[PDB]
Amino acid sequence: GSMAQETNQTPGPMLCSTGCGFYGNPRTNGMCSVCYKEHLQRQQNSGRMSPMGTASGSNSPT
Numbered sequence: 013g014s015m016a017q018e019t020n021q022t023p024g025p026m027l028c029s030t031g032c033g034f035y036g037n038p039r040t041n042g043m044c045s046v047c048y049k050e051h052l053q054r055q056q057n058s059g060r061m062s063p064m065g066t067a068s069g070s071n072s073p074t
């Protein structure tokens with residue numbers, strides 16, 4: 013293996029984290045075009061984002 017001009021595969025396969033089978037982007041949230049929209053919609057609806065096991069503000073009046 014003297015020469016170094018043998019390209020077989022490209023590095024950095026930013027494949028969709030959700031597993032849809034399409035290419036994703038690292039500038040985005042690691043999701044493709046479709047999944048990035050659905051995911052952000054669910055995150056925006058929350059408002060109180062805090063990944064620490066528990067979360068404050070979970071009341072639901074009848």
Ligand SMILES: [Zn+2]
Binds near residue numbers: 028032033043047
């Ligand atoms: Zn996707």
